[model samples]
Target: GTTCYCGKTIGIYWFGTKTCPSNRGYTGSCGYFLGICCYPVD
Candidate 1:
């Protein structure tokens, strides 16, 4: 698996959409399809 960063937390690859939850931070996209990657902020 790949690792990403958002703020001070680690981010994961989120498939299907480019947006994350309100409590999460949207860092960028990941994988072949380029889904949005985000980390927990709250």
Candidate 2:
């Protein structure tokens, strides 16, 4: 994550409790933007 002096931001979502590819949208749209994260699946 990153921040700025202006502190404006944009967001994105997966929109579900099920899957990664089918239930998600694009990440890099760019608007002081944010992105997804992952830890170990195990």
Candidate 3:
């Protein structure tokens, strides 16, 4: 399971990597740790 900023417990999709595009309900932008993530949040 995973945790969200809305204080909701959801399933753990991706974790450790931010370049995987095959994970359902989980995906990271190529060149940046943004979108759904909070580092750049751009």
Candidate 4:
């Protein structure tokens, strides 16, 4: 996450449980998402 000097923040990955108006009215579009504990990147 990145925070500004004004204490405003932009999150990287958060478990959003609420509806977002920017999601094309898909308030319930946060299911079946997968996560990995140990992963490598190249």
Stretches of model 3 off by over 4 angstroms after superposition: 3-12, 23-42
Of the candidates numbered 2 and 4, which has the greater TM-score value? 2
Clashes of 1: 0
lDDT per residue as tens, model 3, 1-42: 333332343323335655434434442332322323322121
Instruction: Give residue 12's error in model 2 in angstroms.
Output: 0.4
Q: RMSD in angstroms, all models?
A: 4.5, 11.1, 8.4, 12.9
lDDT of 2 by residue, 1-42 (tens): 322222233433323322324334433322222433211111
Which regions of candidate 1 are displaced past 4 Å?
1-9, 23-33
Per-model C-alpha lDDT, please?
0.56, 0.29, 0.33, 0.24
lDDT of 1: 0.56
Point out the higher-scoring one by lDDT: 1 or 4. Answer: 1
Models 1 onward score TM values of: 0.42, 0.17, 0.21, 0.17
| Candidate 4 residue pairs in backbone clash | none
Model 2: residues with Cα > 4 Å off, grouped in runs? 1-7, 18-42
Q: Which run of 10 residues does model 4 get worst, by summed lDDT?
A: 33-42
- How well does candidate 2 score on lDDT at residue 23? 32
Candidate 2 pairs with clashing backbones: none
**CA lDDT for candidate 4:** 0.24
The clash count of every prediction, one per candidate, is 0, 0, 0, 0
Ranking the candidates on lDDT from highest down gives 1, 3, 2, 4
Q: Name the candidate that leads on lDDT.
A: 1
Best by TM-score: 1
**Model 3: lDDT of residue 12:** 32
